[PDB]
């Protein structure tokens, strides 16, 4: 196996999707970086900087045109001619996220929209915003760019959803080639672009407190772990994720055990899941 080149571009992100990836257990992030992918551009962790880092990405992109994977973290703001997200400068000219996605988007093998912001707009697109924050797939489509997009949402996603999707795609490509493998990846996506291995089961239907929900036994304070969390605001009933089973951070907790689910993987997050602390 040969580690494919990956560029990780951040738009209107919080870097939470990079940090969650650093928490991957099996494989560890060291193994991902040294054995699974070749992370050629990533502003948070790479050695080089500035125009030199941009030029390096461009040189790899030219050499591996059609073959590199493009990870997008954050939404893409279109208002004000892209000025709400400037990601770099080269040749004495600023590079907006709009510009960058139009440059690299057409030439990637596939775009992985990591996190709810990139997948669906997320908090930057929520009520009260004014930057034109746009989801990756919509931005690409609006600009005539047909490159396949896989959504890996969550705010943040679990590391296993990101790494697992990368591995699923690379394994499909090993088996059926680039075009055939990407066609197989698209077949495992739901109607919101999400891989069904991680997003095909509903939290509530699989929740350990479902018996209490059915019995009408509800907690009135967060620290009462006996009752169902519905009255405290749990959005498990309308959320598709496998958190009930893999849990978070090495299996030590998850949102429903600790507090409530806020529906962070869903296309309407946050506004359609708010208020968070009532039903």
């Amino acid at each position: 196996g040969e580690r494919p080149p990956v560029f990780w571009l951040q738009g209107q992100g919080c870097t939470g999707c990079s940090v969650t990836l650093l928490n991957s257990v099996h494989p560890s992030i060291a193994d991902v970086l040294l054995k699974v992918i070749s992370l050629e551009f990533h502003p948070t962790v790479m050695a080089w900087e500035g125009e030199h880092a941009i030029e390096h990405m461009r040189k790899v992109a030219e050499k591996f045109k059609g073959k590199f994977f493009l990870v997008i973290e954050g939404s893409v703001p279109v208002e004000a001619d892209g000025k709400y997200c400037i990601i770099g400068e080269a040749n004495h000219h600023e590079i907006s996220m709009v510009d960058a996605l139009k440059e690299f988007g057409p030439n990637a093998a596939a775009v992985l929209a990591v996190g709810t912001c990139a997948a669906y707009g997320g908090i930057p697109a929520a009520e009260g915003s004014e930057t034109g924050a746009t989801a990756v797939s919509k931005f690409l489509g609006d600009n005539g760019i047909k490159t396949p997009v896989v959504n890996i949402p969550g705010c943040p996603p679990h590391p296993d959803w990101i790494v697992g999707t990368v591995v699923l795609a690379l394994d499909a490509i090993k088996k059926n080639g680039l075009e055939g493998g990407l066609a197989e990846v698209v077949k495992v996506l739901d109607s919101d672009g999400r891989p069904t291995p991680f997003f095909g089961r509903n939290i509530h239907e699989n929740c350990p407190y479902l018996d209490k929900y059915d019995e009408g036994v509800m907690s009135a304070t967060f620290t009462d772990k006996v009752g169902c969390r519905y009255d405290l605001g749990c959005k498990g009933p309308m959320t598709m994720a496998d958190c009930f089973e893999r849990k978070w951070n090495g299996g030590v907790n998850w949102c429903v055990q600790n507090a409530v689910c806020i529906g962070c993987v869903e296309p309407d997050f946050p506004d359609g899941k708010s208020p968070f602390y009532q039903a």
Binding site: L33, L39, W48, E49, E51, I86, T131, F222, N249, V252
Partner: protein, 484 residues
């Protein structure tokens, strides 16, 4: 322009969080001017308006996935005040355990995964290559290898820190476990065993590897204690309450400027916007009257970061600021290595002297010393916490109220202010750590802290201007926090 003055632009500045451009002017081999530009805006202060105020303690964390527990903390403290909620003693301690664990994560992440490549050559594969041809990497084969081995081990250690956060915080990034009224999960005896077992591994790494390597690497870069002083002015607003009466805190508040210590008065904070992309009529506001009206085309402005000033002073924040203001005893290993490697006799932090403390390498030293200091605080909270004792109250949303939460994020002072009207957020204003550090000029033309600290930085080779971003990284910037 002018003959002899050469402009260098670096965008993106990498191995920080978020979107930053640095532009410097070099003359006679040194930086003589600087401008920092935060190039990405989201507008959390307007997104928050109209919401149930309780939602804030989730929404605000998405300002920054590196320091979300700091925003959670500032938000719930502001909401506690606005709602009249009395956090139970055991919930105060649980909050400190959740947030303190991310101080460990964040400082380790910063030194190894963001900063160490400034001094250490990584493996010959992306993302560790390519890099500047003359990267000024001075370590021996053996010490460089130790740096690489520790970088790799630190990937595990920082992950374990996030397991510690999640034990009572639910998950990380973006905890579920802090709310108005306290913490959502009472610590059990079994989960306290799990937290302590992980803490022991982190403690061992901090004591045996991290603190020693910072001094050891620093001893090969002694020139980096002689640059980066800037204004030599610092702010601390207090953090980690140690009682239920709001008095004693692990880090006590204070301001240091022009060689003088003075108390912190939050009414002296104002945010200027002349050089920021916000409407001119919003300049000069204290956070209780803050306004966020973007103006991305405004002539002369160069950043989405506002310019906070403290009674007109341009100050810095972070580990150096807190350790200088509070002046704790240095760690045993630090005292010994200061003597053995530098010839410095020191017992308390200020024994480094102002010049060496307020320096590029001094800020890395302060962060390592603070990490060691936090170990003792967390040990104290593990002794103090009581399994099974309630950690939360369930207050109703007030119809009209205000509240302010002050804390210290890993990178420096953080406050959140909330005004509630008709049971909804009427205003929410955030003044964050990298805002204090990475801001542009104010309406008086005075540079921000990092802009000023860049003055004098050596650039003997314009084609390999490595010390510009090295200085910036010493402040551990996150531009998501700075702009929000």
């Amino acid at each position: 322009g002018a003959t002899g003055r050469t402009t260098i632009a670096i965008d993106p500045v990498t191995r920080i969080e978020g979107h930053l451009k640095a532009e410097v002017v070099v003359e006679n081999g040194k930086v003589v001017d600087a401008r920092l530009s935060g190039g990405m805006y989201r507008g959390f202060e307007t997104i928050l308006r109209g919401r149930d105020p309780r939602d804030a303690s989730q929404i605000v964390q998405r300002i920054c996935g590196v320091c979300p527990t700091a925003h959670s903390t500032a938000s719930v403290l502001a909401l506690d005040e606005a709602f009249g909620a009395k956090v139970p003693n055991n919930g105060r301690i649980t909050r400190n355990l959740i947030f303190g664990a991310n101080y460990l994560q964040s400082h380790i992440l910063h030194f190894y995964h963001l900063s160490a490549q400034d001094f250490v050559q990584g493996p010959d594969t992306a993302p560790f290559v390519p890099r500047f041809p003359k990267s000024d990497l001075r370590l021996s084969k053996e010490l460089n290898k130790a740096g690489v081995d520790q970088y790799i081990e630190a990937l595990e250690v920082r992950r374990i820190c996030h397991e510690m956060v999640a034990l009572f915080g639910g998950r990380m990034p973006h905890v579920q476990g802090q709310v108005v009224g306290g913490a959502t999960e009472i610590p059990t005896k079994e989960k306290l065993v799990e937290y302590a077992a992980r803490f022991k591994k982190v403690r061992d790494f901090v004591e045996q590897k991290y603190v020693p390597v910072v001094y050891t690497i620093g001893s090969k870069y002694k020139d980096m204690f002689k640059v980066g002083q800037g204004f030599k002015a610092a702010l601390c607003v207090g953090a980690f309450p140690l009682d239920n009466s709001g008095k004693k805190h692990l880090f006590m508040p204070g301001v240091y400027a022009k060689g003088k210590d003075m108390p912190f008065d939050p009414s002296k904070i104002k945010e200027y916007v002349k050089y920021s992309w916000f409407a001119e009529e919003t300049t000069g506001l204290n956070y209780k009257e803050g306004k966020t009206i973007p103006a991305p085309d405004k002539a002369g402005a160069y950043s989405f970061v506002k310019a906070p000033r403290y009674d007109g002073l341009s100050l810095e924040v972070g580990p150096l600021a807190r350790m200088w203001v509070n002046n704790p005893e240095l760690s045993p290993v630090g005292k010994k290595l200061l003597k053995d490697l530098f010839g410095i006799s020191a017992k308390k932090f200020r024994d480094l002297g102002e010049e060496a403390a307020f320096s590029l390498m001094g800020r890395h030293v302060a962060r390592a010393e603070e990490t060691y200091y936090m170990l003792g605080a967390i040990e104290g909270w593990l002794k103090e916490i009581k399994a099974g004792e309630d950690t939360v109250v369930m207050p109703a949303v007030p119809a009209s109220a205000e509240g302010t939460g002050f804390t210290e994020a890993p990178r420096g002072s953080l406050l959140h202010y909330v005004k509630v009207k008709d049971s909804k957020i009427d205003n929410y204003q955030i003044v964050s750590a990298s805002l204090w550090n990475c801001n542009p000029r104010d309406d008086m033309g005075q540079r921000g802290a990092v802009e000023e600290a860049l003055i004098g930085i050596p650039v003997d080779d314009i084609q390999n201007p490595v010390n510009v971003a090295r200085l910036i990284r010493a402040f551990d910037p996150x531009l998501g926090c700075a702009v929000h």
